[PDB]
Amino acid sequence: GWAYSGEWGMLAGFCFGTLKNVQEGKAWFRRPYIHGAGMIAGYYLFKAAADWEDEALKRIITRYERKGYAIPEDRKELFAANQYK
Amino acid sequence: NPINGLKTILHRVGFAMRESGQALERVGCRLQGVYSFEEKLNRHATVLPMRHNVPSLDKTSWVAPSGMVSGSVTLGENSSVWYGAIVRGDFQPVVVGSNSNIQDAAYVGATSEFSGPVTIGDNVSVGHGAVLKGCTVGDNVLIGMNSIISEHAEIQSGAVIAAGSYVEEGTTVPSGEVWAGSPAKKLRDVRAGEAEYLKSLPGRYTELAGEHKGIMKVLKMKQAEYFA
Amino acid sequence: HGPAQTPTVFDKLVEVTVVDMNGIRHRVRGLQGQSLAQALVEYGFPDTYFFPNMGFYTQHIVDAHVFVPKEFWGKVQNVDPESDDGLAVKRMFRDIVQDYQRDTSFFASYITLGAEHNGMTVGIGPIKPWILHSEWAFAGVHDSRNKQFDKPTVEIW
Amino acid sequence: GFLDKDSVTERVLHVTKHFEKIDASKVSPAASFEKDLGLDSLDVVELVMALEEEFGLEIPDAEADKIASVGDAINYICSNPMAK
Amino acid sequence: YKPEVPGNTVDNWTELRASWNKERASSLGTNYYLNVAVMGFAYWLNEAYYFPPRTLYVGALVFFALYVRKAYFSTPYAFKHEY
Amino acid sequence: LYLSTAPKLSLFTFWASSWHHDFSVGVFILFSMFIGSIGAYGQPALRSLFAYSTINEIGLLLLAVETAGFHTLYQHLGIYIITQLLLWNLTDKRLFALCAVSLAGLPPFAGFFGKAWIFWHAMSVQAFSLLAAALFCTLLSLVYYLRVIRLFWTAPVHTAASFTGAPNQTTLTSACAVALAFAPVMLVKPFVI
Amino acid sequence: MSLFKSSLPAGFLFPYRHPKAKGLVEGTLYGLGSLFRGVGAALDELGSMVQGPQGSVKDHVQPNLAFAPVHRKPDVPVNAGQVVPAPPAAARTLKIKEVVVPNKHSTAFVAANANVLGNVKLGAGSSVWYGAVLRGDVNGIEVGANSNIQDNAIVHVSKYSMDGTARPTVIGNNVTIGHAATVHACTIEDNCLVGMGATVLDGATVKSGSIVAAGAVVPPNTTIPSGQVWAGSPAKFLRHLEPEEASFIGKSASCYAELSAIHKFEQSKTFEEQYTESCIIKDRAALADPSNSVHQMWEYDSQTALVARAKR
Amino acid sequence: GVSSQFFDAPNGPSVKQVLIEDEWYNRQRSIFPLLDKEPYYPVDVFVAPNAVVCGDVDIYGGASVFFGAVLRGDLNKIRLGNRSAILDRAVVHAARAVPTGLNAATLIGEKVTVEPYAVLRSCRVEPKVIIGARSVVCEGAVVESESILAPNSVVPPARRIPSGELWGGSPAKFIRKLTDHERDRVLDDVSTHYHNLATMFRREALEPGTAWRDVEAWRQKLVDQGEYEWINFREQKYLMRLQHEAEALEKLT
Ligand SMILES: C/C=C/C(=O)SCCNC(=O)CCNC(=O)[C@@H](O)C(C)(C)COP(=O)(O)OP(=O)(O)OC[C@H]1O[C@@H](n2cnc3c(N)ncnc32)[C@H](O)[C@@H]1OP(=O)(O)O
């Protein structure tokens, strides 16, 4: 999957904490433990999404080859790869 | 000012550590089954810093517990802030000289958007309930009770402002003159027998502040007997 | 400018006699430039008398069904029946009033109190059950002591 | 002003006409119940009940007690927002 | 400057009041009749998907041209005592 | 909130799993899209606005069903369900504008991606007339989502505090669902297939 | 005796502080809580150190200045307050033998944030309101029965003046002192009214049944006779009293007696009562749902949210 | 005389009443109800720790109550508009009735600033108004929108200040007309400036803080000595109501 998905998840967690503060009338830096928990959850959620990227590509190539669609070996590496793009 | 940048970074990091610690202590209280942290007691602070701006109080100055000073406040030698008085320097700073008194429930501050700093000189009597917004007060001046001094007004040395008066914005009051009225105007010159009482006024307040500071120390020891 | 009179609230006061749906006459004081629905709300009438103005971008305005005598028919503000405000009034007549409608039927937010309304007598008209959302409705019976004035907000959502 | 000042007046005269203790020609559009027509309180209550029957209203005791004239009754019906 | 409202206030307000002095029906009849119409007669359009596109487009424009709007609908038959 | 999310998911999964018919649903696509868009344009009450906009969205989901390609159906349904979870639990009214820009299909937010794979697969199998009707109704939907933005974004902010405890009790879920501005990085990839 | 007076758990009866733990699980939780409290206070102190000089200012409770002493002076006679013996800690530390505390009648109301200090006498049914300053330090302050000093009003006396006269402040019965009024070394007779924001200076006399208007400044050594209204800066004669204003003065005094009762009722509740009341407010809002599953079996007391009786 | 016990309070009668001279620390709440009249406020309000907001008070939006100010809604209602500032030790009160016959509640519009030591009682202040310092606006008076009152001014009861003007004096007279830029921008500027200062105070507040640790230490010492009393407050309130009902029944017959 994508190489920078965990950093994107951490930025998502920071924005999550800032919005939870803004909704309840607090300044952006208040309750930094909420930011930290949000960062951890965002990191692991977007890493799981990046794992599903590779899983979906593997499922597509496996189903297509079992149906009779013969893919050349120069193009099978586009699918059967845990590519860290 | 990059010095203020380093101070800002340190103050924000320490604040985050303080929030985390107080929250963990409240979780510990909940685990113990004790809910004293939920008490809605009075959270008034006599000294109130504004981030890294701490009031600078002399060791011989006194602020009454119902009084308050906030932000960049300088109190000189033997100067007093009495009961209910509010001296605010969180926007623009406040500078108070030596042997000057801010009497009970008086407001001295520089919080307007275009106000300069407040500068109060030496041996200054600020009366009860007077409102001072962004002004400069010279040495040996009585500010009368429930009076208003506006922004950029200059109360020069030896002048008397009578009770209930309102000095307009940017108004210079000359030396040794008495001014009165809501459109405040010169009434007369200060007389000599008047000036004797003007000279003898701030020392009484100095000794009264000493007596009240001692009684407040007695009250604090009485309070400390309960929990210690 | 000279020795002319200081402005008093009594110069801008408008008095309207209002007859509620029980027939009880009430003395209602308002100020010039204030609408009639606002003066009715501030007098202390119950919340079952009021309903949203059913236009777009104006459901935060409370409104009431009033009966206006023929002398004061020409002092209600004019509404184009082809405009969007006209369709708002048509929706209110279609849904809220229905067969309580008379030839004296108006809506109280379309009456702006001035000196020409001084001494005018109006009556509160009945309305059908309605709903805007779960937190603002009317079941059909005027049995509630809750004033409209005591509501802190008027909620469109 | 909720209703006109002519048809209500002739309806008032029409229901005042059928009273046995009243004179069918002495009744004027602006008279009095006490000095002119010679009625006590119960006759006034009976006349107000007849007016209520004709116009389909409900007039309380204090309001009907304030009504002392033909013009007073006409003005009360005209000022009423629930008249028929 | 503000534009003047066209017309007269009494005449405009009588136009606003018109055809609404009537109790509104419940919506259950409209909903039940719509469901009956769809569940009984929408199978008549099954072969219509294969018809030529000029016919389908003209039929859609014809349905749009003959449509009567449900909101602000009124009939003169609501206030007459005989046909 | 319960009625707009769970039964649609259950029934569309039954449709994906075990259903074939030899017919079409195109007239109901046209009816849903045009009726929902015009109704939400014309109804001033907000509950009726959201009911008619829901009819428009189910017309788009039916366009995804009719042209096959259930991957675009599932992507749009998931984005819609997350928006619904944000919509019915809002206490701060400024986030009502984020629901508006993400239900109008405006580009950087996730509703654009959910609409745009439906449009892409419809254009792939050449369902031109239903696609043109969908594009016209998408142009109409923007007007009342802008009405939503006018109502709740260009207004002074007031949010009442809690008094009997439970202080703003669903800020976690609403603030988590507002981060549908970060899901588009995963949506552009071949993800839902 | 609600319905379950002998079966409710101790946490429900004492929400402010749970009783002593007994079993293994509760003691383990208590020990974890003490560890969490220690680590949390340590992290708070470390964060205050990292923060800088602003962290040295700590959170402390404030003294009760509603009933506060002053120095007993030998030249100042004590006629309003009372001379009480000093605490032994004060005596052994900073040489105090006698202090002066106020004389406060049991029916008077003082706000918890007011400042009443020293040589002050408070009459029966009288009231001092939020933020008021009554500093009797160099002379005496007397407040009569059923008199009110309203919010942010300042009362002070003089020992040394311009003309060398020590003047107390005496306030009579049924006197209303307006919002943010300044009362300084002067005499207010019975059944008078001082307007809100007004100023009465040194040695001025307000005779009985008179009114000082709002914003007025009473110059020193001015006598306002009975049945007159004075206004302006400086205050001159304006009007005679109306027939209705004299009864309005008594109405104002009675109204503040009724108000001081309610405010004293709310103010003098303990922390444990306030926390129990917050838990009751929470239960009442949970019971306001008509679909609550307990509504079909139990009937709840309105004021305490306890089960009163079985409904069915 | 009036008793200080209320058996028809919403949460019941007070079981234990503490005399004020027996208090060893300051317990003044800043926001508290008076029987059945509870204040209403938003999530982003600034209430200063030594300010008092009691009774029937409605606060909206970004309003702020600064140091030592009092908003006492015990005789009527008080409403504070969106982004309206009550500065240091100003008093807002309300009468039960006004001579004009209108509603006697004090209604303050949005974007209204009230300078230090000013008093508002049963008055109507329309949006975008600057009330000067040491100013009094009396019962039933009306201050119209986009107007300014000079410091140390008295507005007598049932008087009016016209819109778009600057008024001042005791009694208040005409000074000058505001410029169009003053009505367009300056009033909103003053309100926004004071809201920004209130936000600066709101960011740095640690609530509830740590001052409770000492009081809890004293209570822990009392539990150590065995002198801490556990009071069943709900049951005591119930029993007090039952005794009150029995005492009321045992005197009519
Ligand atoms: C919270 C507790 C509240 C209480 O119970 S009482 C405490 C607060 N009450 C008050 O506000 C007391 C003051 N109220 C009044 O105004 C009153 O008592 C004040 C009585 C003399 C007079 O108020 P009125 O509403 O009776 O006003 P008048 O008819 O007497 O005014 C006559 C005159 O005096 C002037 N006047 C009136 N009132 C005042 C004032 N105040 N200041 C200066 N000048 C004034 C005014 O200019 C008038 O002249 P013009 O306006 O030029 O025609």
Ligand SMILES: CCCCCCCCCCCC(=O)SCCNC(=O)CCNC(=O)[C@H](O)C(C)(C)COP(=O)(O)O
């Ligand atoms: C279904 C039928 C059942 C009916 C049963 C009910 C019958 C009740 C009848 C008994 C009630 C009475 O007589 S009550 C007794 C009435 N008599 C008195 O009170 C003595 C004083 N005389 C009057 O009041 C006169 O009415 C008058 C002088 C005209 C005063 O003139 P006005 O009037 O201008 O006031």
